[PDB]
Design a protein around this ligand. Structure first.
Ligand SMILES: CCOc1cc([C@@H](Nc2ccc3c(N)nccc3c2)C(=O)N2CCC[C@@H]2c2ccccc2)ccc1OC(C)C
Ligand SMILES: [Ca+2]
Ligand SMILES: [Cl-]
Ligand SMILES: [Cl-]
Ligand SMILES: [Cl-]
Lengths: 58, 250
């Protein structure tokens, strides 16, 4: 996986490393799941999410 | 905003309204509890830097519903490369005097990393643009916050599809050439927000165009990806006396 294709499979941010290596990362207010790709909120009001809609699906 | 719809209250929670002496000036985008991104050109005619107010959680300008939060603007930071009365480098970073409180109605838009924004977000076709600008060319401004979905063009395509300043690498086109749908001057400074896998990000700033929703012409937006490291560095800096700050770019 390389970050230029399909975002490296990352939900959010992606860094290429020497080798066939890639590390996904998450914005502040999120943490990376054990899949190495997914980001889940760690705070009540993470950036870029709409509370009234996130509760309309909670 | 021409040809959009009302943003349901709370669905544009990052939108900022900028006022000078109580009068609508521009939009902006909340990116943290103390930081707002807007357009440099919003500030070209400011006399008293100390009567600039930012409002978060606004929706209907006719009423107070208790979700609004007003703050003084402590710092307006503009890149050294921006020249007043011209189009390039049209971005400003605003420091609020005290943080806003995040609530259902007040939430930051994510400022993306440069690589993500260039490699991924730049290829998402549609993004939302919002503001309390004119509903029609030569018309009244909106009382309720409006939102519009617009498609992004590659600049070579924008130039071919259009028929005046250069579209530089610090800009991008989005919208429609048929006169139906656009942002307009009173939306200046507001967000061009891009959805990717469940999260929204800041990709552009309402910057310029011809007239408003003018046939043959697309909206032009500041390309925020060019400014990520410039913004992040400034967000780590101490405030300085005097509201306006010109900061080196790059
Ligand atoms: C960099 C901003 O440059 C310009 C800005 C503008 C206008 N803003 C927009 C924004 C988005 C537009 C869009 N999506 N579609 C259509 C038109 C749009 C107009 C604006 O803020 N104006 C005009 C009247 C006063 C005020 C101003 C303008 C400049 C400075 C202060 C206030 C119009 C021409 C500009 O440059 C010329 C050279 C094309
Ligand atoms: Ca209100
Ligand atoms: Cl939580
Ligand atoms: Cl410093
Ligand atoms: Cl001052």
């Amino acid at each position: 996986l390389i970050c230029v294709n399909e975002n490296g499979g990352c939900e959010q941010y992606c860094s290429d490393h020497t080798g066939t290596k890639r590390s996904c990362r998450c914005h502040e207010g999120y943490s990376l799941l054990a899949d190495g790709v997914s980001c889940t909120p760690t705070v009540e009001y993470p950036c870029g999410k709409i509370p009234i809609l996130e509760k309309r699906n909670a | 905003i021409v040809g959009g719809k009302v943003c349901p209250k709370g669905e544009c929670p990052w939108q900022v309204l900028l006022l000078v002496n109580g009068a609508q000036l521009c939009g902006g985008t909340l990116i943290n509890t103390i930081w707002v991104v807007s357009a440099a050109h919003c500030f070209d005619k400011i006399k008293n830097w100390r009567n600039l107010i930012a409002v978060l959680g606004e929706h209907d300008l006719s009423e107070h519903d208790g979700d609004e939060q007003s703050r003084r603007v402590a710092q307006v930071i503009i890149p050294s490369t921006y020249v007043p009365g011209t189009t390039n480098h049209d971005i400003a970073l605003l420091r609020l005097h005290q943080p806003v409180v995040l609530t259902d109605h007040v939430v930051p838009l994510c400022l993306p990393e440069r690589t993500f924004s260039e490699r991924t977000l730049a290829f998402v076709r549609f993004s939302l643009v919002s503001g309390w600008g004119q509903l029609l060319d030569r018309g009244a401004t909106a009382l309720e916050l409006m939102v519009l979905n617009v498609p992004r063009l590659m600049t070579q395509d924008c130039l071919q599809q259009s028929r005046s300043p250069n579209i530089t690498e610090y800009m991008f086109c989005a919208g429609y050439s048929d006169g139906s749908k656009d942002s307009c001057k009173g939306d200046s400074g507001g967000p061009h927000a891009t959805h990717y896998r469940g999260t929204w990000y800041l990709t552009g700033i309402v910057s310029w165009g011809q007239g408003c929703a003018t046939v043959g012409h697309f909206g032009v937006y500041t390309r925020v990806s060019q400014y990520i490291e410039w913004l992040q560095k400034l967000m780590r800096s101490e405030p300085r006396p005097g509201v306006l700050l010109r900061a080196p770019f790059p």
